[PDB]
Design a protein around this ligand. Structure first.
Ligand SMILES: Nc1nc2c(c(CN[C@H]3C=C[C@H](O)[C@@H]3O)cn2[C@@H]2O[C@H](CO)[C@@H](O)[C@H]2O)c(=O)[nH]1
Length: 320
């Protein structure tokens, strides 16, 4: 456990007061998923952009740099190629739309200099992308670190990982402050690394496990502690919420980032996915944790209305 995500989240799950895993539900979900041999959707090529290996690598870095927090009213929606998109697909469609119109979002020089007005246009639609100014600051940070550290080529960073998914997460969090996804719980550091781990899996997806997306240790990635996978784990009965937390999610009351309740949901999401992976594997359906994550996240896209709302956390980068 070379990143310490499973080890530190395990401490949270064992002590957790608002969140617990129903291991009976895990076994019952495993039985059903293993029977119909469910796999995750193929990495989505319609709404993800593509080009040369150097450009595609920078595109993945940019995509996942700003891959967070799409909720709010009025709902942020985007028009691309005849269809309207919200949430993640709005992020993906907005970047692809921009690049196709010749916006150089793969050029470190441009990224380093990008204005509030530039990213407001890239993400222009109904409402406004949450934390707009924050995404401008991250794209500047991302651009200038690419330029200074890696000759404006994320391929250099990937090359230095030596086809270790875990080594690449560590290289990203070391170099890019905004990818440092840790918290504390009862005075102990909890490590999560949602966006850095997503990034590694998105390279694997984009490059078909070849060239820059080649990794010999993808099994070492955990789930990505977001707000849809826990909502899917709650819907499937795997995650249970205590009264006060349940009522907060139902009332759509925002939950402060790094608060005990938020850290417990995220830690229980990691261990919810890992317990489902173990149970599935025991029933002869061996998947990697990131594959179980993708599968569950896909389920998140078509939950039956009346399902308990996802937790609302404003992703904070107070330590720029
Ligand atoms: N755990 C998890 N979270 C994901 C994703 C994604 C998008 N992933 C795509 C890439 C490969 C998968 O098959 C998906 O189509 C966004 N997100 C996050 O979901 C939330 C709402 O989009 C945000 O917190 C995003 O950062 C995921 O796969 N797993």
């Amino acid at each position: 456990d070379r990143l310490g995500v499973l080890t530190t989240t395990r401490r949270v799950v064992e002590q957790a007061q608002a969140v617990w895993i129903d291991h009976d539900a895990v076994a019952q979900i495993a039985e059903a998923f293993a029977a119909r041999q469910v796999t995750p959707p193929t990495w989505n090529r319609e709404l993800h952009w593509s080009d040369g290996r150097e450009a595609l690598a920078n595109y993945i870095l940019v995509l996942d740099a700003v891959n967070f927090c799409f909720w709010g009213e009025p709902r942020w929606r985007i028009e691309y190629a005849g269809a309207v998109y919200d949430g993640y697909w709005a992020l993906a469609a907005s970047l692809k739309r921009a690049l196709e119109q010749g916006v150089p979002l793969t050029d470190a020089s441009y990224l380093a200099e990008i204005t509030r007005d530039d990213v407001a246009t890239i993400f222009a639609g109904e409402g406004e992308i949450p934390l707009l100014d924050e995404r401008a600051r991250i794209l500047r940070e991302t651009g200038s670190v690419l330029a200074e550290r890696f000759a404006g080529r994320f391929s250099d960073a990937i090359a230095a990982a030596g086809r270790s998914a875990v080594a690449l997460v560590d290289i990203v969090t070391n170099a890019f402050p905004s990818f440092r996804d840790v918290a504390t719980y009862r005075g102990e550091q909890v490590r999560f690394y949602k966006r850095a781990q997503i990034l590694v899996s998105d390279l694997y997806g984009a490059f078909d496990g070849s060239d820059l997306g080649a990794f010999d240790d993808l099994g070492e990635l955990t789930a990505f502690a977001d707000y849809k996978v826990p909502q899917v784990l709650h819907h499937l009965g795997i995650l249970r919420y205590a009264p006060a937390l349940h009522d907060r999610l139902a009332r759509r009351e925002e939950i402060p980032a790094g608060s005990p309740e938020e850290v417990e949901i995220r830690a229980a999401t990691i261990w919810g996915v890992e317990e489902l992976r173990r149970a599935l594997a025991s029933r002869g359906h061996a998947l990697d944790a990131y594959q179980v994550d993708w599968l569950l996240w896909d389920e998140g896209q078509r939950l039956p209305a009346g399902t308990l709302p996802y937790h609302r956390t404003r992703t904070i980068f107070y330590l720029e």
